[PDB]
Symmetry: C2
Subunit: 416 residues, 2 copies
């Protein structure tokens, strides 16, 4: 920023430009120096092995590597854990002494890898309680304990949840296919000249920002130990069907709601910016806790610098205050997200903030944004790349466009 | 090639207009779980069985060659009719020459008689497959023949293959590339390896 505070992209540049390169082969790390002139004489290697965020082993090895040379580092016999989960190895190079340009403890390079994984073969504990379905003309209602879920039969969306008598939502949980456009999506360098190839112009012409959901199907069933709700929706613009969404919600005896989503995208509409859900939660909590890539904002084509771990930040750090407001704050590769009493599990991307995608789209300056009631949560199965080879022509590479035609993802929403 | 399936779950429910069967299986070798498969079968009033499959693959096992189903059908029909890429054999990294259309061939053209027997005969990008009275719909790859994968693996020469009873059908959600930059080192590019960790696909099996 003009006051010399960093954008989140500065950390991506730091990692890609590091002077040490690392390879892992079994138990050996190979450290290669990209210095031309100096020996590594102010460097030590911290390693750590963790299992789904919880630490298991650590260590430090002093680096002694000639300019353009290699050093092999053998790790001690790693622990075999009983429990299920992915093991991660993380190395960081730390400078123990101050320089002319850095403080003591400056981290100059890092790298992360997956080691062994144990898949969970334990079937969930069978609960005695059965959730109760009630059916009016307007609604399906599911009660279990103090918990309640309500699905509106005209819209076919989850419209409210209660814990006790405390309502949890301010807006229903609905599909989302759009983002507040980034500067690379707008694709303008001269304010007098408009490109029709720009992502935002293609999305606007096709009607993605205006598409209205039509309900196709909405039904409810009692199984032995669960309630199943099944919905389908079509998004249309002027006769043309752009997207179809088929969902199942399965509410079991433990109180966990499992959501399964299957989406079809017309092959001739421009590829959507995202495929996910959004809602506005009634509460405002101080912290956000997640297990996945961080701690900084990261996108599918800018995530090499983020590391998988357990992160905890205050809510205001989950928003990036770009001077011209846009989509911001995404965290990728997430397995678990905790916010107040809510927990979401899956394999997803999310952003969480006090500003809707709509408010970010209609406001031209950050100082004119005002916090909305509650918190806006965007949970995505899939998200387009952000580009940036330049900003005045389309620049998202084809491997980061959402061009597969069929998409599938699942979440579990529960109360921790 | 040795992994044994262990049953985790198998339950049945009557819905308003359908029956739902739900299964889970773990494939193991010496304590280590290699794959987990969760399936639903939903049999409705029109007689269509809808099958939904979700697979997890351990990150540290080598990427599998395919993710799909197989069975041996009792009947032997003369023709195979499909809507998808053809008419020749095509694989995920060798399909640029095949065109999407409606193809009809005799069963013996669905097998490629390579002198040293191997996996052969795959057709990709398929939306519909008709064989005798059966129809399968989805978005899948298939091969159909009189030889099991096991017989093709254990036999060294094509002239020693013998037709089995009925027909062997392999239906795949996903299939690895075949390589061929050379034949004496690994040569399948990373975009054609099955490295995603989680896989999902669905079929409808019905009688036409």
């Amino acid at each position: 920023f003009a006051d010399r505070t960093p954008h989140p992209a500065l950390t991506e540049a730091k990692h890609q430009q590091q002077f040490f390169q690392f390879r892992l082969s079994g138990q050996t790390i190979e450290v290669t120096s990209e210095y031309l002139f100096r020996h590594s004489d102010n460097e030590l290697l911290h390693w750590m092995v963790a299992l789904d965020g919880k630490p298991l082993a650590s260590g430090e090895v002093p680096l002694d590597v000639a300019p353009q040379g290699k050093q092999l580092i053998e790790l001690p016999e790693l622990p075999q854990p009983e429990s299920a989960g992915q093991l991660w190895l993380t190395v960081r190079v730390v400078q123990p002494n101050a320089t002319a340009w850095s403080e003591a403890g400056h981290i100059s390079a890092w790298q992360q890898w997956r080691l062994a994984e144990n898949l969970s073969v334990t079937l969930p504990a069978a609960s005695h309680a059965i959730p109760h379905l009630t059916t009016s003309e307007m609604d399906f209602c599911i009660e279990l304990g103090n918990k309640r879920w309500q699905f509106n039969r005209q819209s076919g969306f989850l419209s409210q949840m209660w814990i006790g008598d405390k309502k949890q939502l301010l807006t229903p949980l609905r599909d989302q296919f759009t983002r507040a456009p980034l500067d690379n999506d707008i694709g303008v360098s001269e304010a007098t000249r408009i490109d029709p190839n720009a992502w935002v112009e293609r999305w606007k012409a096709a009607g993605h920002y205006q598409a209205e959901a039509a309900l196709l199907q909405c039904t409810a069933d009692t199984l032995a130990d669960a309630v199943l709700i099944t919905t389908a929706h079509a998004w249309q613009h002027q006769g043309k069907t752009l997207f179809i969404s088929r969902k199942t919600y399965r509410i079991d005896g433990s109180g966990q709601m499992a959501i399964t989503v299957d989406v079809e995208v017309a092959s001739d509409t421009p590829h959507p910016a995202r495929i996910g859900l959004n809602c506005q939660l009634a509460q405002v909590a101080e912290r956000v806790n997640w297990l996945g890539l961080g701690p900084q904002e990261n996108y599918p084509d800018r995530l090499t610098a983020a590391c998988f771990d357990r992160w905890d930040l205050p809510l205001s750090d989950m928003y990036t205050p770009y001077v011209f407001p846009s989509e911001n704050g995404l965290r990728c590769g997430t397995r678990e997200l905790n916010y107040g009493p809510h927990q979401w599990r899956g394999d997803f991307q999310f952003n969480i903030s006090r500003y809707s995608q709509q408010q970010l789209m209609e406001t031209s300056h950050r100082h004119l944004l005002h916090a909305e009631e509650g918190t806006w949560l965007n949970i995505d199965g899939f998200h387009m790349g952000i580009g940036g080879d330049d900003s005045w022509s389309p620049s998202v590479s084809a491997e980061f466009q959402l061009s597969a035609g069929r998409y599938h993802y699942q979440l579990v929403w529960c109360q921790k």
